[PDB]
Symmetry: C2
Subunit: 217 residues, 2 copies
């Protein structure tokens, strides 16, 4: 099988973790750098990836399922790490300056060009909310990073469970300081599936017919 196809046909959404297996620090470092290298519109990188690693942090994450989507709750303590994909509520010229200043330091643009680079900020203004927020534009950028992570995990042979069945309001309460100025609509559990109890590990993957999703013109 073609290496790319094999990876994508074999990755799947785990429904049960093995609590005695952890992701190595070597593999976690590759995953985190892969997230950091994700592309985004105008290199805005309007995101924050919060890694739930310690037992203390796992408890806080476990508690965020207090009143909602409790089918996802068992994974928190059983998996190795949980990663929260947060997207920025409002993206400002100051936030963009952080990006452009780093670009000047990394040698891709010069100081005079920096002011010239501020024209791309047009894209941010084109995506302003009725309330002055940009979440409808920043959230999709975080999902791009998520697509990148799922492909990355398939290559490392690490199991995972993407989760939209989370409580954004409660997470904003529990991780008050960390999520300040951001919102989180999706999380990702990673680890190793249970050798016998993960029923999804043996089910066939199902997707729509090629002609139903692809059109060649």
């Amino acid at each position: 099988t073609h290496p790319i196809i094999h990876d994508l046909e074999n990755r799947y959404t785990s429904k049960k973790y093995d609590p005695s297996k952890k992701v190595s620090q070597e593999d976690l470092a590759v995953l985190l750098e892969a997230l950091r290298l994700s592309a985004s519109s105008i290199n805005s990188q309007p995101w924050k990836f919060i890694v739930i690693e310690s037992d203390a942090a796992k408890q806080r994450m476990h508690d965020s399922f207090a009143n909602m989507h409790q089918f996802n709750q068992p994974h928190i303590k059983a998996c190795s790490h949980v990663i929260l994909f947060a997207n920025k509520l409002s993206y400002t010229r100051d936030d963009y300056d952080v990006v452009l200043s780093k670009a000047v330091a990394d040698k891709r643009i010069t100081e005079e060009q920096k002011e010239a680079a501020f024209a791309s900020f047009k894209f941010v203004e084109l995506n302003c909310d009725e309330n002055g927020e940009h979440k409808a534009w920043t959230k999709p950028q975080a999902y791009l990073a998520l697509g990148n992570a799922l492909h990355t995990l398939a290559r490392l042979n690490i199991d995972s469970t993407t989760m939209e069945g989370i409580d954004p309001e409660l997470l904003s309460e529990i991780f008050a300081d960390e999520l300040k100025g951001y919102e989180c609509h999706v999380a990702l559990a990673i680890g190793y599936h249970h050798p016998s109890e993960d029923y999804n590990a043996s089910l066939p993957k199902s997707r729509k017919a090629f002609e139903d999703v692809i059109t060649i013109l």
Copy 2:
């Protein structure tokens, strides 16, 4: 360098294509199958990938820049193929029926189990607009597929240019029948970069400091 990191450090946004080079049909088939295999919330797959391959289709795509974002226009005819990432405007039971029906055909689930499997639809209703549209939920799913595509292209060593600088309204007119019931906010040109005029090929990649985007708890 670690294979995953090398791929992600070496992929970049091409700013000029070599018009004499095309993506092979074998590579294109891998890319399209990779898109089809993308994960999505509840396996909704609320997308359509429109591939602009023919000269006739390239002309139509070229014409969609008549009013705005002309800086992206030169790539259309110069690149090999352009792929439109379309997300569904409103997701219904009928739509989910196509997913569940294919699931049974794939032997992932049974006919009787199909009706029980319909209980995941809570997520769709959960994301329903006051206008009965789910575009704020479907668009992020398409961006996940895009993140998957960018990683896939890095592995195939094919150059690309993601584009949000497009005209969704004009695209809806030009590709009237193909985009009916969908909207398109992002496109992707693929091909091979110009050997000496793609300035971005020799510029360093720049991303925020690890500490600025990642928090370990």
